[model samples]
Target: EVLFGIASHFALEGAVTGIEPYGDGHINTTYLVTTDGPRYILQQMNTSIFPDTVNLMRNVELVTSTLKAQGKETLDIVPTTSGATWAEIDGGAWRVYKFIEHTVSYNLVPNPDVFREAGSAFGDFQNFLSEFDASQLTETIAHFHDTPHRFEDFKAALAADKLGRAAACQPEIDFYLSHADQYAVVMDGLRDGSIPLRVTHNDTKLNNILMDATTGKARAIIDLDTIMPGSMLFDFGDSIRFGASTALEDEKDLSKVHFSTELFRAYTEGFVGELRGSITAREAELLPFSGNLLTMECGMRFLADYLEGDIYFATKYPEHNLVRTRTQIKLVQEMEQKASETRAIVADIMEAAR
Candidate 1:
């Protein structure tokens, strides 16, 4: 009924020509809606994950509307004539956006230049949101990146041992447990207001950034679902989680996953270069450590999901969760090895920018 209403509202009378699932994000059910006139992207925002649909949509409304007002290219939200931002259909919520023609996204980039392009795109996104008061933005998911909360959840899952695979992966579990305390330093600061909050994309994976098909330059950063009040580290860390790794995020072969410092350097150079004047001194001081913290946070989540019978993350095989857990553990270990040098590189970049 809501679909019919939406179709009728938009005068999409040619019949729903095509609807296909799009993107691979864990959250949301997205489809490419094709009509006779122009194609649009229809997304059924996962209400279960994002409980505050009203607030979330308002955030999107704020950002997109603001950008549009500034004459910047933003996703054109299709609203009902009554001024409603979204439609509820068959117990699910749906929204539409006019598709940007001739835009492309890549899952993997072949070189440092592409990484830099992505970095600049996100950096520019931060720059755009700089003037907006992030405190006014609601927490789409409360404690989304609260590392201590994640650690507590990890401990609970280990105790539950719902999957019974804990015995087999004790060594890997021990490896993660040994370093559990390392992330506390940053988390403590965030909690105590020592580290300031900023507007962040929260999901800054390579695909979230759109590249121009002709120039291969990153043109825009999409996936505004996770845009909220959070640490800039969350964005930087999540990017490294996906971008710096050598293998697929959930590759079964543990040997394939490793962190690339070169990729880290390229991204940092691009990120900090754009924020040179805007980012705070404290954020700059802890930039290097954010990588390790992000890696550890991800590894903990993977292990916790595995121990909890894979309830959180979708897994392909019996060992898939464990494979992912180990890969992140390996990457975290590599980050530990290069921690000092990474710090020095950040310091150098900061100095060079000055």
Candidate 2:
């Protein structure tokens, strides 16, 4: 009754017949809302991850409204009866979206073709918002892709050593600390007007995209919580960070965590193929470098969490964050080794796009 009571606040159709837990998402509490009139997706917005609901919903409203204006198939905001985007029930924020019929999402990239489609989905996303002024949107998560700030956080986490886990992971801790100088490359480029700020989908994961069930093509990209003003390279690089990895993010075996250049080429081909003339020359040159940097940034975060008693990222075991950190380390190490090859891959894709 409590859940229904909260969901009823939204101006939904029918009687809100039944609401069942939906999806394997970690951040938000999702429900597949079934109604006699129309199906909907009801979500209890995670306040811990996203504290400010006002600015966040404003960003969503602005973005979805823009996408709708452009005639794109986006997740429609099912506003409440009171004309608000989200409902405040107790301390938790709840919202609803009209369910997209005949759509599917994948947790893993099955092949290069699928990964290529993922690239195009985000590539088209960037193309769609390419002209939007990023300053208008709030930083849903401040210093989200600010790699330099992340480096500082890591330093503080290491210094505090709240859990005293730092001693066990000296190598992992040192790995990030030693390479701190490279953290500001992308930010420096953005600050100097070399790389323009674009409205970026900060969290670019495969599961976030809804594919056309019948056509197997990317239908729409969902999960808009982290949408903010940042370098689009962060989007592309983070995609390369996880999508092209050969192993799971927390795989205990380090040997399996290699970077897939073939997948990299496929994704780059799709990404650059979509944004050929739009991206700057410097952006193209730094594509592969962004991959390395994002990977390192993720590892540092994981290590920092491990040191800080696994506060941010959910960890199943004591060493889970450490395991995740090691996997990222391995991926970054391999990315560094393949620097020339990945650069050539991006260059080739750009050349072909011409």
Candidate 3:
């Protein structure tokens, strides 16, 4: 009854026949609303995570409009009856979008091919938005991928040792501290203009991409909430951090948590293939480094949360954040060992694409 009432506020192609739970997204409440003429996705915005709904919706509208103008397949926002992008129902907000049909998304990397599609998906996403000015959009989450600021928070957590948990993860503390100088690598590049600032999908997970079911190509890049003005390295590296890993994020077994170079090659091939001419020299040279940067940034955050008594991230058990932190640490370690190999992969891809 509540979902139906929310759907009524929007201008639908046909009368809504049914509305049911949709994706497995953790932040917002999503639903698949089916009508007689076409299908749509109705989402209840999560005000707790994003308090600025006005700017958030505006960012989405601006990006989607620009993408459509660029002749790309992007989320088509359906306005409400009052000509608003979002509708306020019962003191909460909701928005609608025409569902893109014949598409598939994966929560896990099934194989190298699928991971490659994830790469092209984001590459195409960046390419399409290349002409669009990123300064025009609002940062829904400021300092989201700012690894330098994150390092500061990590130092604060360690100094406070709020829960006295730092002693247990002493090695983890040393690991982060030893690599402190590396955290600001990407940010430093952005400041000096070596790496061009562009529109980046801060959440570059595989599921954010909708692949063509038959051809198995990336059709669209969804989950625009974290779309912000950042380096292309952030987008490329985040994908490697998530997709190129062999095990789960919180997997406790250190031996099992390893990096996948084959998968790394697959993603790089797809990503570089799509943005051959557009990718800059510095961006290409530092592509492999970005993977290590993002992975370490995440590990530091988890370690910080654990040090602060798991306040930021939700934990199933007392050591959940610690386990996640270790997994990220393991990934970063492996990425570090294979740094030259990974760089070779990117170099080959860059050479061949040209």
Q: What is the C-alpha RMSD of each candidate to the true structure, in Å?
A: 2.8, 1.8, 1.1
Better of 1 and 3 by lDDT: 3
What's the residue-level lDDT of 73 in candidate 1? 68
Model 1, 145: alpha-carbon shift in Å? Answer: 1.0
- What ranges in model 1 sit over 4 Å off? 1-5, 10-26, 33-39
Better of 1 and 2 by TM-score: 2
Badly placed stretches (over 4 Å) of model 2 are 2-8, 13-16
In the range 1-354, model 2's lDDT, one tens digit per residue, is 787788778888787788889998988999998888899999999887689999999988888888888998888999998989999888889999999889888888889999999998888887888777888999988899899999999999999999988889999988998898899999999999999898888879888999899998888989998889889999999999999999899999988789999999989988888888688998999999899899999999999899888888988899999999999989888889999899888888898999
Task: Tell me the lDDT of model 3 at 253.
Answer: 85
* Model 1 lDDT per residue over 126-195, tens place: 7677677778788887777878788889888888888787898898779777877776766677678887
Question: Model 3, range 164-273, lDDT digits (tens) per residue?
Answer: 89889999999999999899999998899898889987888778889898998889988888778889899888889988999999997889989999999999999999
Ranking by TM-score: 3, 2, 1
lDDT of 2 at 244: 94
The residue ranges of model 3 lying beyond 4 angstroms of the native Cα positions read none
Q: What TM-score goes with each of the models?
A: 0.89, 0.94, 0.97
The CA lDDT of each predicted structure is 0.79, 0.90, 0.90
How does residue 7 of candidate 2 score in lDDT?
Answer: 78
Best by lDDT: 3
Best by TM-score: 3
